[PDB]
Amino acid sequence: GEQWYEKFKPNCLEQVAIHKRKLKDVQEALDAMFLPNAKHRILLLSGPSGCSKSTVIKELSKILVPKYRQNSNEHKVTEFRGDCIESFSEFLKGARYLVMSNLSLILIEDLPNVFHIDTRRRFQQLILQWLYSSEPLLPPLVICITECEIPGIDYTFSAETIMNKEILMHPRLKRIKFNPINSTLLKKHLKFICVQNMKMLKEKNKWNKRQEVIDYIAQETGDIRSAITTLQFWATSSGSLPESTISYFHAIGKVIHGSHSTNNDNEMINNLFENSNNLLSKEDFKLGILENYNTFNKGEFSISDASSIVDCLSECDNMNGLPESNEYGLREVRKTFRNISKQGHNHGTVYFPREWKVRKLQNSFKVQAEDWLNVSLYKYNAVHSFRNITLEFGYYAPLIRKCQSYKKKYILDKFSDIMKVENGIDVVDRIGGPIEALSVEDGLAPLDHLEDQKKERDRRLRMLIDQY
């Protein structure tokens, strides 16, 4: 019945699941805080779940509190509970006495009912009063916040929404942001828990296949507690426990090639819809059909059938995702392909839609167009619209600049303006690349260079600003 992570909770500061950089930064900040003439009174840690926020604080406190305690144990962290049945103010007033020989770190992981506006205002006022307190001798205050949202305070409960601007940018408040545990540390901790449970693992004969699952756990999430719970559940369970691409392949094949177990189109359509509604609800399915219908008879069918299929797909698209649209489209596809099926099925490779690649290329084109617009504005005092860039300046201007640069290089006042072209900050290649064709995405590629392109654009913008 007892849980594993509680049994094997960290005992020292060396087995804490957190990166060394964050641990060192927190330790240094906390040590500087304990100094008599400290600069921060409240230490605010804010991060996602399972980041060892309170655990690291407790481990550091166990060694730090005795150092600064004055002459007059187990009261290292006087944590406050948000379900104690105005309590926060009384707790603050009581902790105020916990100074000198009564030194005790204060930890506020659990927060009070801050949903109502009045409660949030009271909490903010109390925090501001604590920060404005003139008492030279005050106890440490540590506030740990876990970030979560469900896409205002209702939408998100991050640090930004919990305290006002005066506290967010307070000159005497240190805010630290944690990071999820990396794969290596999680794997190390999981294998340590294993090394501990070797006895039961050998008794159940699961020692040989532990490495086959641990990696998956380490690759699932960076939450130490959740990973340990999952490992314990897997070790305890005697069964086998853990797709979309296979379902997509089967659905596309049944829609186009058709099923053999059931000869009734209506029954197959109804069963497929009932069993798999989410897969067909997404618009991409239609695109997939458009990308896969030509595979029927390796494209050896009359153009009339293809025209009818495409017209139906367009009509279904115009229906704006109604339940009848998918029914109608699939029934057209099945009926059309059944009338020209010779004897059997030729299960060709299923190709995913190319829409995602087109969207990525469009995003890259937009980034390049923005960079070109910035360069034009900051080097020639010219402003052009996005449509003009896509239609007119996308091709003409790069060609002109390339010709001018080639002439400049060949030469080195008939060409005086030509040599003024600066190779470094002038676009000479057509924006978006040559317009030749786009190949089919045979590979899975369920889905970055966009971030690198944006960084490059920012660097060029800074260079132009320096020039300007």
Partner: protein
Amino acid sequence: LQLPWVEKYRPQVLSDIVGNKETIDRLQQIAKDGNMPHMIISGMPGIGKTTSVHCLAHELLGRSYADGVLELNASDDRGIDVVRNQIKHFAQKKLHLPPGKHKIVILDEADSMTAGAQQALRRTMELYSNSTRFAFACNQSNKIIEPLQSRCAILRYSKLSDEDVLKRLLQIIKLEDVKYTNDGLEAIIFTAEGDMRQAINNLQSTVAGHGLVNADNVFKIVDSPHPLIVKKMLLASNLEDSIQILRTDLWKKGYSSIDIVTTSFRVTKNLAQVKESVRLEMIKEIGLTHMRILEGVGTYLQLASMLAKIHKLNN
């Protein structure tokens, strides 16, 4: 006065539960394992989510079911503080139990509530984690914050389907001694749309208000458009007869255009004599009519045009 039929004879063991066989098998293997982790149940309500949780509690605890189970709506009192107080009073109560087994708390309807109180519930679970295991019921898994799903295991359920709905209705009628006919059960299943609770409520209402369970008797109480009338209207050989049926039996009875088109689509989805081409053409026409209605033109002329197009298709 009289209690609802559904609550009177709710299933007591996982065997009676039907549908989502893989999830039932997972619950059974968890029960026989003797160690029960946290759950996040998701699915459209009325498919034995809460009932499955209570049946799992039955199979796990047994005699201490009433002393180790607490169902909370989480919004009855419009306050999370009182919910936390109740959870504290329940968990903190000292009851000796055999090793391994832990108390079970069900927090129903966690999807109609904000993220901050989800974090508060996560903190409460973390504090009371060695004695109580939580089963968060919700309608959407993604709505629950990421930490909650990371901590717990997600259980995805789906509709019970007509076969199992009919099966449970046969047992309910057998134990209730209710006179029934096949068309009545078909009508009950059609109105239920996969919801067991709705099916049982409709059956109870039909048995109370009327006697023999017939389609006419069932729809005298359901109040939804009659599928047979819609089928006759759609399959009427002559256009004028279909128009008259639509005007009299449907339009003058107050039925909305959206309901009429939905019933027509549902009827067309299941037909026998209509050819596949005719069926899909009718589906296309119904879909266009639905799109037109949803955009603002919810008038009778749209339904008349749909009927005329359907009749032209049948020619």
